[PDB]
């Protein structure tokens, strides 16, 4: 090679760079830097309203983890009254 000024005037720089908000990643799921969402509380279908829905709700989904466990329902089989149709 051969140098004239100055390996640099202004040194190495913005090539790693992150600084004020070193953000991307830690952040993005800056939906959820705080997966904060809803109510508190409580009644029902939360998951707003964006998100949605509740799709089939109670213990389900939510699980997620809805919460909680309820004198239900209680999933197990038979019912839902397989309401289809």
């Amino acid at each position: 090679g051969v140098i004239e000024e100055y390996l640099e005037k202004s040194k190495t720089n913005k090539e790693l760079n992150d600084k004020k908000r070193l953000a991307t990643t830690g952040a993005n799921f800056a939906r959820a830097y705080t997966v904060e969402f809803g109510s508190c509380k409580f009644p029902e279908n939360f998951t707003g309203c964006q998100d949605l829905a509740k799709q089939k709700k109670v213990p389900f989904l939510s699980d997620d983890l809805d919460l909680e466990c309820e004198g239900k329902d209680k999933y197990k089989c038979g019912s839902n009254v397989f309401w289809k149709w």
């Binding site: 051969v2 140098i3 100055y6 390996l7």
Partner: protein, 176 residues
């Protein structure tokens, strides 16, 4: 049931070692030394920026006229006089052997106590870090690998490519 398996020079491999390795000294501390931001900068204008190049392959010649000279003198009188024929003392010679070198010729010898004994004590020092240097440099010669492979963008050769996150090379540390 265990190899058979070798040596004998088992005695000599060990002295290009102290060659290879001590040696890597030269690269190990001067690099990192370098001198981060000395103040700074690396600029070499002097014999070098205007006299039509300086070296490369007059480089080597001068460069290892010396290494020339000295690397030879190195193993080929390390020691070994007697220096010819003709029945076995093994190393593949010691055809120096029972005679060191001379029957009452000159001062072949260093040092009193009819031998060459650089005295008894000093296992210390160089058993340790030094056949270290052998070991050490295995892994910061395994850094040579890490330190640069990946041919900083400026070239993908035989395009697999084959996936893609982000870059790599050297300066110290790591993302992690």
């Amino acid at each position: 049931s265990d190899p058979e398996s070798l040596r004998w020079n088992v005695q000599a491999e060990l002295v290009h070692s102290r060659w290879a390795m001590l040696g890597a000294a030269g690269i190990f501390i001067p690099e990192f030394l370098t001198k981060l931001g000395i103040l700074n900068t690396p600029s070499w204008y002097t014999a070098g920026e205007q006299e039509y190049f300086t070296d490369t392959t007059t480089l080597f010649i001068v460069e290892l006229v010396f290494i020339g000279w000295a690397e030879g003198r190195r193993w080929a009188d390390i020691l070994n006089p007697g220096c010819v024929n003709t029945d076995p003392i093994f190393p593949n010679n010691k055809l120096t052997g029972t005679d060191v070198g001379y029957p009452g010729g000159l001062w072949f010898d260093p040092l009193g106590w009819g031998s060459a004994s650089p005295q008894k004590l000093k296992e210390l020092r160089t058993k340790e870090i030094k056949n270290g240097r052998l070991a050490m440099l295995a892994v910061m010669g395994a850094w040579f690998q890490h330190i640069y492979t990946g041919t900083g963008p400026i070239d993908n050769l035989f395009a697999a490519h084959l996936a893609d996150p982000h870059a790599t090379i050297f300066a110290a540390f790591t993302p992690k």
